Symmetry: D2
Subunit: 340 residues, 4 copies
Amino acid sequence: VPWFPRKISELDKCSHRVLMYGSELDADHPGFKDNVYRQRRKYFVDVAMGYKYGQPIPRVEYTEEETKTWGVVFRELSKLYPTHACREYLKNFPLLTKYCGYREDNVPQLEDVSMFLKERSGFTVRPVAGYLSPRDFLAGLAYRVFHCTQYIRHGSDPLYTPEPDTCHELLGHVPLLADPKFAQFSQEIGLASLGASDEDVQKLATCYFFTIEFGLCKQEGQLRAYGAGLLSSIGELKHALSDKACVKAFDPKTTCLQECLITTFQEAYFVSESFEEAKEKMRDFAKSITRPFSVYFNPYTQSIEILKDTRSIENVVQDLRSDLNTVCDALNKMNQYLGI
Amino acid sequence: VPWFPRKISELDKCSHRVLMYGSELDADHPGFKDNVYRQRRKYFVDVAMGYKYGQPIPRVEYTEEETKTWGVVFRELSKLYPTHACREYLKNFPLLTKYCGYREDNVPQLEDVSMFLKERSGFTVRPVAGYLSPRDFLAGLAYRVFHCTQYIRHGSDPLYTPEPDTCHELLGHVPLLADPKFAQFSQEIGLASLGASDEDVQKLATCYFFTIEFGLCKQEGQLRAYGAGLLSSIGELKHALSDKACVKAFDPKTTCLQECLITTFQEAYFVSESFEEAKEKMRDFAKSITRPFSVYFNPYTQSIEILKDTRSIENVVQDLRSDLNTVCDALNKMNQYLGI
Amino acid sequence: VPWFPRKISELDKCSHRVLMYGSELDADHPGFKDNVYRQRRKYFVDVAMGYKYGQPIPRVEYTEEETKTWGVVFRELSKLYPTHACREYLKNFPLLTKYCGYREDNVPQLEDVSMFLKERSGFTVRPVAGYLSPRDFLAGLAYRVFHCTQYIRHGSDPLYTPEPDTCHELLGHVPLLADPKFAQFSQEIGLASLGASDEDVQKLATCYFFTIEFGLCKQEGQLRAYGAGLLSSIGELKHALSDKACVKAFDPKTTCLQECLITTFQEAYFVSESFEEAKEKMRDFAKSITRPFSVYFNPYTQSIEILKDTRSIENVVQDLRSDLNTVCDALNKMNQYLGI
Amino acid sequence: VPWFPRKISELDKCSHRVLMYGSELDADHPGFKDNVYRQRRKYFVDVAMGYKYGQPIPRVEYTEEETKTWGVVFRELSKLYPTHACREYLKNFPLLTKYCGYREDNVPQLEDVSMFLKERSGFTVRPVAGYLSPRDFLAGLAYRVFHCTQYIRHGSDPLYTPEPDTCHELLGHVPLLADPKFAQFSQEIGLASLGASDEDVQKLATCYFFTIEFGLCKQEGQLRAYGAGLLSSIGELKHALSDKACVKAFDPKTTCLQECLITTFQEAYFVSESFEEAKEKMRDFAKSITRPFSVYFNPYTQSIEILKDTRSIENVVQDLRSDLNTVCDALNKMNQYLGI
Ligand SMILES: [Fe+3]
Ligand SMILES: [Fe+3]
Ligand SMILES: [Fe+3]
Ligand SMILES: [Fe+3]
C-alpha cells in the first residue's frame, strides 16, 4: 500500500511535498506583471519552507496595504453573516474577535489561531507553500492538522481571488474548526483515506469538496451556509442562498462523481442536515473503499495504529471498558446526590 | 471544593507553588558548609523558575565532576537490574540507551527524555525547584506531566542521597513511564485526587508512596522491583529482594494508613501482581473518596470536564459508540480477508 | 399515554381485543352462500378464543379437502421460489420441510412451528380470531409474538384469497422469522410503537406494510422478494419481479404516506438492501415519534421497562459492562491459543 | 472436552442422570425402619422421574401430617429472620407470602413458585429424584434452572434433617433467587463450569458451597446471613452471628481448598460485602480454569454459544452497539424533557 505517516512527526514529509509553489503566479493572475509583489510573495515561500514540528510559528508583520485589504474583506463580508451563515459559525466568530484579534485594523496570526483552536477542538495549523496534493492534505486532517497559507490578495481588487489566500482560511475555515463535531467530521474524512488507492482518494476529496467547501445546511427551517468557499466569497454566498441555483440532498454514492469547478459557480450545491448526519453518511460510504486493515488514532501518543490482528483489537476493547466505567459512576453520583 | 486546574495551561499555577526550594538545602546536607556547590544549586533554581508552557526546555551543560558522579551511579546500578528489576524496566532501558543518551560521559537532557516519552505513553517532563506539595504533584499526573529536578548529588559520595536529584528521576522513574499501562495507572491515581479533601489526598499520596515508589511485583515464581526508591538506590534494592524484609500483599484499605519513612528502610513492602491488578484495586478504593462529581479527561483538548448532569454523560456515551464501531469494522475486515 | 402491556402475560388483553371475527364472512366471500363452510369457521373461532398463556396450543386435524387445498398451493407456489425468493428464505425452507412437516398430504401445526421458531430466533406464534387492530398487532411483536390464523381457503378457488389464512402465515411469514436479523428488525418496529399516539401507529403500520409485507431486496445484483404478500401469492410475486412495475427506494419519511391497497396490485414496490440497513433507517425515523420515555426489553423476565430516570439507565449500563467483558476474554483466549 | 448441554431442551439428560435416589433412605434415617413413609418416597421418586421440558409441573397434595410438619418449621423459623437474615431476603419474603402461599396449613407448590420466579429474575424450578452430580447441578444454573425436591421431613421431631427436603429449597433458596443480582451471580458460577475438567468443577462447587449455601454478609454494620444452609436451619443460623465461630473473609483462591462438612457446623464461615463484590471475585478466579473457548448465553433462544472465532465475536459486539443506542437515546429524552 502507498506510504502514509504513522506519527505526527513523520507528517513533515507530507507537509513539504509541495506540487506547485505559492510564488508561481499564473498568467491570468493580477500581479503577474508586477515587481514588488512577486518579491513579497516569494518571501512567504521561504518563511513556510522553514517550519519544523515543535517550533512555534514565527510571526509575520503585514504592511499597511495588506492590512487595508484584509480590513476591506472583513468589512464587506461580515455584514451578511448574521443572515446567511450557520449557527455554529455565529457562536464562534465573537470568540475569535475576542481572543485572536479579528478586527478591521489587525490581521490575525497563525500562532494565536493555532493556540485558540488547540484548546477548543484539538486542531492546529501549520503554514504551507501552496498546493500540496489531495492525498497529503487528507493525510494531515487525520492528525487534526490544517495546512494554511500566509500571503494575502493583491490590493488591486480586494474581492476577487483565484486561490486560497490567508483571508480564505481565517474567515472561511477557522471559525468552524473550533467546533468539536466539525472537528470529528473532518478527522474522519481524513482517516478514511490513509493508504487508499489513488482512485478512492479522488472520491474522498470530492466529498470533502462538496461538504466542507461548498456545503449548505437547513437546521431550523430555511437553510444556511457552512462551507468555506461560500463563507469567504461575497459573490457566491448570495447566489447559493438566493433561489436561482439547484440544491439536492447529500449522497456520497452519487456526490463522489461531480465536476469540481474552480472559476465559475457550481451546477448544484448539496444540502445536508447536521454534521452528525453527514458524518454517518460518510462513515457508511467509507468501508466501500478497499483496504486490507483498519486504522485507529491514539490521541495520547498522537499516532496511527493498524488493527489487523487480535492483540490490537483486544487493547482497544480493554480501553473502551475503562471509559464505560466512568459513565457508570457519574450516574451513581447523580443518583446518590438525588433520590434513587 | 479546592481549586484544581481545568486545562493544561492552568497547570503553571501549580508547578510554581513550591514549598521549599532546591537551593535552601538542609543543614545535615553534605555541602551545607560549602561555597561553590551552594552557588550552582541557585543556577538550577533560577532556570527552573523560568519555565513556561509551550517553550522547549533549555539545555543544561553538566561540568566534569557532575558527569563523573552520574557515571559512577550508572555503572554501579547497571549490574543489578538484570536480576533485580522487573520485566518492563528491562525492555525499556535499551531504548533509552539508544535514543536519549544513557551512558557515562554525558547526562541525559530533559528535552530528549520528554520527546522520547511523549511518543511512547504520552507523558512529558518539566523542571521544578524542588518539593511541591502532594496535592500539586498529583494534580500534574492527571494531565500526564511529571515534575523533575535537574541538579545532581554532591560529588562527595556518589552513593548517598537524602533527596531526589536528576539521577533518581532518570534511572528510577523514567524507564517505566514509557509503558502504556504504568502510564494509565499513574494518571488514574492522579485523576482520583482532583478537588478532594486534604484528608484523602494523604491516603492517595500514601498509596502512591507504597506502589510507585517502593513497590514489588512477582511475575514469575520470584518477585522483582518496580519502584523508583528501589531502582535508584543500591542499598535498598538488594535488601527488599532478600530474606530479611517483611512483604505483604497490597490492599489500599490498610496500606493508606502507614508511616512513610524518609531516611531508614521501610518495614513492609507490599508486593503486588500486575499494574492492572493494582489499577483495579485503586479504582475500587478510589470510589470511596467523597466528591460530588466525576471528572473526565479529554485528550484532544487536554482538559478536565465535570460530569454532573446528563448532557455531559450523553456526550461521553456518543463518543464511546464511535470507538465501538472501529472494533466492529476491524473484525469484519479480519473475517472477509480470511475465511468467515 | 395509551395502555400497553408491561409483561408477556398481560398480552392476553391485546390478543383477545378482536375487532371483527374470522367467522364473519363478507358478501363477496366465495363461501358467503355456503352452509358447511361456516360451521367450520365457527369451530376455528371457538378454538382460538380459548388460548391462554402457558398452555400448549391444541392440535387441529384438517379434513381431506383442506389438505388437498394446502397441497395445491404448496406445490404450485414452490416451483418458482428458487428464482424469486431471497436467500434467507431458501436457506430456511428445507429446515421447515425437515422438522415441521411442510409437504403435501400434511398441513403444519402451530405447536411444531412455534417450537421450531423458539429455538432459532425467539419468536412464537399464537392463534387469533382474525383482524385485531394494528396497535395490538404491533404490541405483540415487541415481545416476539406473532398472531396467526388457523383456517384455510375455500376449496372452490385454491389460488385467490381476499384475506390471510393459515397458508399465508406458514409460507409467507414463518420461513423468514426463523432468521435472527429479521427477528430483530420486526421486534424493533414493534417496540417503537408502545404507548404512541394513534397518528404514529399508522405511520409505523404503513412502514411495516411496505417492508415486511410487500418488500423487495437486491443483494447480489438483480433483486428478489422478501415480503409475505408476495411470497404467498402467485399473481403478485410474478409481477413485482417483472418489468411492468415501479420499483422505488425505501425512505421511511415518505413511504409512511401511501395507499395500502388491499385487493389490487401496489403502484410502487419499495426496495432496500439488507435487514440491517432497513433496520437503521427505521431506527433513525423511529426517534421522530413523540414519546416522553424510552423502553427497554428485558429478555430474561420478558418484560418492558421505562427508562425515565438515572437508576434504570445505570442498570442498563452495568449490564453492558458485563457483556463487554465476555468479548474481552474471548479475544484473549484466541490470542493465547495462537501466538500473541 | 466433557459433554455439556447446548440448549435448554438438552438439559433433560442432566436432569435425569441421578446418582442416588430419594427413595433410598440410609441406615441412619429416622424413617429407615418404617413402612408407610418409604411408600411415599417411592411415589415422589416416580412423579419426579416423569417430568419433561415444556409440560407444567403436576401438583402434589400434601397430607395432614406433612402439612403440620411444614407449619412447625415455618413457625419456628420465621420468628428469627427479622434480626438474622439479610435485607434482600426480608424484602422478598412478604411477596412470597402474598403470591405463592407461604403460610401454615398450606405447602407451596412448585408451579406457583416457578411462575413467581420466572417474572422477577428469570429462574425456574424443576423436580429431581435427589442427588445429581455437581457437574450436572451446575450445568443447570447456566440456563437459570434450579433442581428441587418435593418430599418433606419425617414428622418425628421436625427439626433435624440430614438432607435437602422441600422445606430447605422453599425457605432457604427461593426467597433469594427472586433477586436479579443473586440470579446473575448464580448463573455466572454455573456458566464458568461448562466443559471444564473434573478438577475445576470441584473448586467451583466448593466456592458455591461456601458462598450460596453457608454465606454471610455485612451490609450496614453487623453482618447477616444469606446462605440456604443457614436460612433453613435453626441450629446453625444461631451459631453464625453470635461470636462463637470463626468468620474469615472470602477469597476464591484459598476458599476453594477447604473441606465441606455435612453433619457438623463449619469450622469457618466466609464473609463478603455484596453479591457484586463476590461476583467480581469469582469472575477473576474463573479466569484460572483451563478451557480453550468462551461461552455466551443467548437469552432469546436460551442456548449456549462457543466464542472461538471472529464471526461470533463480531455478532456479540454488534448487539452491544444496539444496546448502547438505547442508553444514548434515554439520556437525550431526559435532557429534552428537562433543561439541557
Ligand atoms: Fe478552503
Ligand atoms: Fe520519585
Ligand atoms: Fe402476512
Ligand atoms: Fe441448598
